[PDB]
Swiss-Prot record, chain A:
Functional note: Helps load the DnaC replicative helicase onto single-stranded (ss)DNA and simulates the helicase activity; in the presence of DnaB more helicase activity is seen. Regulates DnaC helicase activity, at low concentrations stimulates the DNA helicase and ATPase activities of DnaC. Has no measurable ATPase activity after 1 hour incubation of 6 uM DnaI with or without DNA. Another group has found the protein has weak ATPase activity that is not stimulated by ssDNA.
Protein name per UniProt: Replicative helicase loader DnaI
Annotated gene: dnaI
SMART domains named in the record: AAA
Region (C-terminal domain (Cd)), start-end ranges: 86-248
Induction: Transcribed at constant levels during exponential growth.
Region called N-terminal domain (Nd), residue ranges: 1-85
UniProtKB/Swiss-Prot annotation, chain B:
Annotated protein name in UniProt: Replicative DNA helicase DnaB
Binding site for ATP: 31, 33-36, 68
Taxonomic classification: Bacteria, Bacillati, Bacillota, Bacilli, Bacillales
Subunit composition and interactions: Homohexamer. Interacts with DnaG primase, as DnaB(6):DnaG(3). Interacts with the N-terminus of DnaI (shown with DnaI of B.subtilis), forms a helicase DnaB(6):DnaI(6) complex. The DnaB-DnaI complex is disrupted by DnaD (DnaD and DnaI from B.subtilis). A stable complex DnaI(6):DnaB(6):DnaG(3) fragment can be isolated; DnaI and DnaG do not contact each other (DnaI in this complex is derived from B.subtilis). Forms a complex with DNA clamp loader protein tau (shown with B.subtilis HolA) tau(3):DnaB(6); a single ATP hydrolysis even is sufficient for complex formation.
Residues of the full protein shown: 183 to 303 of 454
Superkingdom per UniProt: Bacteria
Length: 248, 121, 245
């Protein structure tokens, strides 16, 4: 009922066929729960690929703490009593929130989580849930938006410009990284947002890590011998700051 | 050394050179070290110690060994080479592995199992 | 002159004949550039032969290094630290008393910094990092969790298990963190120097009765080949004092 509308809206742009190529996507789309009403997902055409951007809900004392860059403040507001649990493993999370603030101090160490799904499975309400309570106190879990962050963190690592806004992805007691896999020079893997993984298990910090998809399969994604038994160990460099749980 | 440079300070002292009038020979276990053996004696006695070498390849021809040697006077071959393309900062010390074997005289025979006739011609 | 320095550095390990065998090495060592205009040559004892490894280039930092941690919070020292209780009443007694008994090869016994976080495991080795600093020796602060993640999974390999073993002062952080597969990295470090001898360094969060719930099982009598080399190089010591996080 939405796809039809979008299709004809951009049918001048959206080359044809593909259905069979994106079969997996469209089938996974219908198979899942999907749906939604601080933001909403909308499709956008970026070059030759179609992405999913969040626009603030038109329906629009923690946000002096909960200020995240490269995403807006209309769409950061979800709690834990705002709870109508319908799908499974959204239930298997009632000891990874209340007990994910009682011992996540400053250099507490261990294993958080690895959120995933497709492109909008109430992720911005669980990365907005679990965290709030940490910052409801003087504890830690920074919000950050990677697909928007990096867009100039290739060409802003310069003359103090963003140089000085970009050492705090390494030193805040905790910090999250969002829907990477969106786009991507390969230096940022080990210079901008791969510099989040070595300086956080060397002094060790209880950091959150999210994504469009999962670490166990984010190990073979980018091959547009090398990164196969070599693309797995960044999902390993990921695997130790957190303990993975389902999002069915 | 007494003596033209053999290649190593381990190999020049003992051989005292090099000298004019010498038929050398080297043999290894099953691919266990006889090829690159010479592929780095006379090459470093062709790009580091003076001698315009007429080289002559056998089972492994020359349009193959250059994929197996551009990585000696430029620090490469573990990033990897037999996997494909390289990065724009790894495009580095290749242009000095492309300036330390190019302004020089290395003259090889690509021809495999031919007797001494064509060669001593 | 370099040979003299190396000889007394590893005297406990090196033998007179070893010197004459590695003569070529030690002579080549002194003959070449001792300084640099990116690395410097240092002698290391490898089995029965002495080799020459390169380490990367008042004086307090250049003659100090660290493996797999950040140099932000390591600004620590001896003496001046506000001493708390029996947590540090007997902690600055075996790192200042022996600033000249880290003997090159003449058994200069070590320490083992365990216990609890933010107080003592790695900053008491950051303490030496700016104290054993003026005299001109290196002191590499190796970190464990950060090592075996490129060494639990597989550029070169058999290279950095030797300039971790050919320099006079060292400092290891967190033993038991994250038969087995953690084999050719840390396990061998303990066996070697019963025939070489210097000042040994390891540290963790787990004491000598707690180091072993994490170095992983085998089901055996096949794991205590390196643990009668701690019980004879220090004492069962921990640290419970002041948070610095």
């Amino acid at each position: 009922q939405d796809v039809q509308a979008f299709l004809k809206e951009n049918e001048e742009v959206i080359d044809q066929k593909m259905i069979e190529k994106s079969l997996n996507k469209l089938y996974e789309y219908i198979e899942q729960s999907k749906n939604c009403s601080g933001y909403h997902p909308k499709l956008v055409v970026n070059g030759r690929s179609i992405d999913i951007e969040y626009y603030e809900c038109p329906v629009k004392k923690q946000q002096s703490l909960m200020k995240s860059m490269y995403i807006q403040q209309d769409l950061l507001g979800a709690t834990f009593q705002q709870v109508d649990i319908s799908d499974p493993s959204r239930l298997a999370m009632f000891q990874h929130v209340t007990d994910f603030l009682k011992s996540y101090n400053e250099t507490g160490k261990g294993k958080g989580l690895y959120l995933y799904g497709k492109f909008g499975v109430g992720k911005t309400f669980m990365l907005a849930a679990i965290a709030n309570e940490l910052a409801e106190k003087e504890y830690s879990s920074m919000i950050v938006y990677v697909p928007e962050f990096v867009r100039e963190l290739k060409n802003s690592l310069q003359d103090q410009t963003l140089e000085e806004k970009l050492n705090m992805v390494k030193t805040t007691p905790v910090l999250m990284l969002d829907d990477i896999g969106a786009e991507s020079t390969s230096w940022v893997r080990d210079e901008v947002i791969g510099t989040v993984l070595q300086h956080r298990m060397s002094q060790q910090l209880p950091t959150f890590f999210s994504s469009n998809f999962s670490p166990d399969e984010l190990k073979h994604h980018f091959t547009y011998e090398k990164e196969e038994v070599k693309a797995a160990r960044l999902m390993e460099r990921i695997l130790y700051l957190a303990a993975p749980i389902r999002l069915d | 050394i007494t003596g033209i440079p053999t290649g190593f300070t381990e190999l020049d002292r003992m051989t005292s050179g090099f000298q004019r009038s010498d038929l050398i020979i080297v043999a290894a276990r099953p691919s266990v070290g006889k090829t690159a053996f010479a592929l780095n004696i006379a090459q470093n006695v062709a790009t580091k110690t003076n001698e315009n070498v007429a080289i002559f390849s056998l089972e492994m021809s020359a349009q193959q060994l250059v994929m197996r040697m551009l990585c000696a006077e430029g620090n490469i071959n573990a990033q990897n080479l037999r996997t494909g393309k390289l990065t724009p900062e790894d495009w580095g010390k290749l242009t000095m592995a492309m300036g330390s074997l190019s302004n020089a005289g290395i003259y090889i025979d690509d021809t495999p199992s031919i007797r001494v006739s064509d060669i001593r011609a």
